[PDB]
Design a protein around this ligand. Structure first.
Ligand SMILES: CCCCCCSC[C@H](NC(=O)CC[C@H]([NH3+])C(=O)O)C(=O)NCC(=O)O
Ligand SMILES: CCCCCCSC[C@H](NC(=O)CC[C@H]([NH3+])C(=O)O)C(=O)NCC(=O)O
Lengths: 219, 221
């Protein structure tokens, strides 16, 4: 069983949790609670650049989010059939990541910039990203983004749509193919089970999770 | 068929790492220099940019946008991404740390003037105390000429590229890392990297104030 080192929160670990779950892979979590808990991992030599996420899998101590996901994805045949496929898959998920990152960091944002940035994210969603993934689906009219078959692109995209729904339920409304993907994916039995209460799925980060984060990561 | 074609402004930015990867692999490419807000708008209205942004590279029938999507493709094609899934893990771990420090250096110019000093002081701390030791430790782990699999890889090329920008910022920084020093000399001497380094190659100057202005007009920031 792979073993995930992170604090109890979404952060930069959630796309790994959701991709393990979708692959039907069972896993352990070791939760950092304090800054003493992080420093213990550092000291023990466990963290290449002294940072989490880290995952123990197949005898490596794999740090860096993209290093973790690229590996999980090949292992479980969620990374396409060849390097042209990987290429489309990579173009899509990096664009997802780019929006992902704007959402992820919105609460560590200085208070006086908060309104501006939320506004910009919504416009980007409406004008940049959703039209881009709607035009891919419409292009081929298939059930999956790439290769008429399940990949990490579907998993990362649908994950992200849940996060946008929590922001504004109106945003997706003029994107019918995006809605239809959301449903179909959320109905795959492994994804359905992750979305169910009681799973490892993590909630949005409230104020006191943010505070525990400033404590442990010292920002 | 077709040389690859690179769409960017005339500057390092986010295109440079691709320039250095393709030339290291001995791969010739064309370059089309974006020079104005209107030039960018043309490529948007022609349907050329998946997210309306550059870098974009035409290669093998594709219009690849996103640095990492372009680099992963080029690396794979010319056998610079290890020999298996496990080698590809170690490569990605290393080159994502390089990207992290890489990002810090790139966005240095667009800092507010009052924070510039604190944020140079901080780059410098992490280099000395986090990033340089981690790479030195790897090289010392196996005593081998390359970072991964004792065979030339994209991590070697990205680390050495970055080794150059750490030097234009401060020469004293790499000077307590003998193994990083040695790697830099070695890779710089391979025939294709040597030919990227010499005058008149597509290799780009450090970004200046003027060029920070043209970036502002073009990308509208
Ligand atoms: C609003 C959510 C914020 C949650 C906290 C940030 S994630 C914790 C942070 N880790 C990273 O920033 C890792 C970045 C790395 N590039 C990756 O993607 O894995 C860390 O250990 N930082 C500690 C350090 O740098 O010492
Ligand atoms: C200060 C010197 C560095 C200049 C950086 C600007 S690069 C231009 C920028 N492109 C991106 O940031 C794409 C990022 C993307 N994730 C990638 O890595 O390719 C852009 O098209 N901007 C236009 C837009 O997003 O609207």
């Amino acid at each position: 069983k792979p073993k995930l080192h992170y604090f109890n929160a979404r952060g930069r670990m959630e796309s790994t949790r959701a991709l393990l779950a979708a692959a039907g892979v069972e896993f352990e979590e070791k939760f950092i609670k304090s800054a003493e808990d992080l420093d213990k991992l550092r000291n023990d030599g466990y963290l290449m650049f002294q940072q989490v996420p880290m995952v123990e899998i197949d005898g490596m101590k794999l740090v860096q989010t993209r290093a973790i996901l690229n590996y999980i994805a090949s292992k479980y045949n969620l990374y396409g059939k060849d390097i042209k496929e990987r290429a489309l898959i990579d173009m899509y998920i990096e664009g997802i990541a780019d929006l992902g990152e704007m959402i992820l960091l919105l609460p560590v944002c200085p208070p006086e910039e908060k309104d501006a940035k939320l506004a910009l994210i919504k416009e980007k969603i409406k004008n940049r990203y959703f039209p881009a993934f709607e035009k891919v689906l419409k292009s081929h009219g298939q059930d999956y983004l790439v290769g008429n078959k399940l990949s990490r692109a579907d998993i990362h995209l649908v994950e992200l749509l849940y996060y946008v729904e929590e922001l504004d339920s109106s945003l997706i409304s003029s994107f019918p193919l995006l809605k239809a993907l959301k449903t179909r994916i959320s109905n795959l039995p492994t994804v359905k089970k992750f979305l169910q209460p009681g799973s490892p799925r993590k909630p949005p980060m409230d104020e006191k999770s943010l505070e525990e984060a400033r404590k442990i990561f010292r920002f």
